Ligand binder design. Structure first.
Ligand SMILES: Cc1ccc(C(=N)N)cc1F
Ligand SMILES: [Ca+2]
Length: 223
């Protein structure tokens, strides 16, 4: 997250870190057994880390649970990033409490102008590299479809939305991949892509979660 703020420990209780020896992606806990992330975060040997603030220090509220299965969306295209969404099932159920909690799926899609919270352990620099230990947060509005398409001609599908600031300076970034965009207490987006980070007229692009609620529910119901 570039141009954000320190969230505060366990203040984003649905935020997970995906770890394969090191943090490599975020994700969102959606029930005691399942995490939503980006398809571009797929790899084998994932350990889901819940209750994290400082990802380098065991602070006492963590739960570390290995994935039993990952399910990349059947229509994910890694070239275009269309349908950039994955489900990860935990080998055992997380213990839910104030600091480890699931986030609601949307009942309807969120409109341009809606204020959201984006979070992660990604790069905090737009030129250069600095990776934080503690969770970073950014408040950002959803942008209009027309402005999103103007920023990224030929690249925005019906399964994507832009959020952030056309002026630059505030954005998600590398390492935030797969993490949440939460608006009015609903998971509306997944950190997906963008050209660089926090660049003028190059806002963040996010997977449009509301398009996937049926798939998520029926996948969970049978897996
Ligand atoms: C992998 C990646 C690329 C760009 C952005 C962004 N500028 N929002 C975020 C990301 F997670
Ligand atoms: Ca920790």
């Amino acid at each position: 997250i570039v141009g954000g703020y320190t969230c505060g420990a366990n203040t984003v209780p649905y935020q997970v870190s995906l770890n394969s020896g090191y943090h490599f992606c975020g994700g969102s806990l959606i029930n005691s057994q399942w995490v939503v992330s980006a398809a571009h975060c797929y790899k084998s040997g994932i350990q889901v880390r819940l209750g994290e603030d400082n990802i380098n220090v065991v602070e006492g509220n963590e739960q570390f649970i290995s994935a039993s299965k990952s399910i990349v969306h059947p229509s994910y295209n890694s070239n275009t990033l269309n349908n950039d969404i994955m489900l990860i099932k935990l080998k055992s159920a997380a213990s839910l409490n104030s600091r480890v909690a699931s986030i609601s799926l949307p009942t309807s899609c969120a409109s341009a102008g809606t204020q959201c919270l984006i979070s992660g352990w990604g790069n905090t620099k737009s030129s250069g590299t600095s990776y934080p230990d503690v969770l970073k947060c950014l408040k950002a509005p959803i942008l209009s479809d027309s402005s999103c398409k103007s920023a990224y001609p030929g690249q925005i599908t019906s399964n994507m939305f832009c959020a952030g600031y056309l002026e630059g300076g505030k954005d998600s970034c590398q390492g935030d991949s797969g993490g949440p965009v939460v608006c009015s207490g609903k998971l509306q987006g997944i950190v997906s892509w963008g050209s660089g980070c926090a660049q003028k007229n190059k806002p963040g692009v996010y997977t449009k979660v509301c398009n996937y609620v049926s798939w998520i529910k029926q996948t969970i119901a049978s897996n």
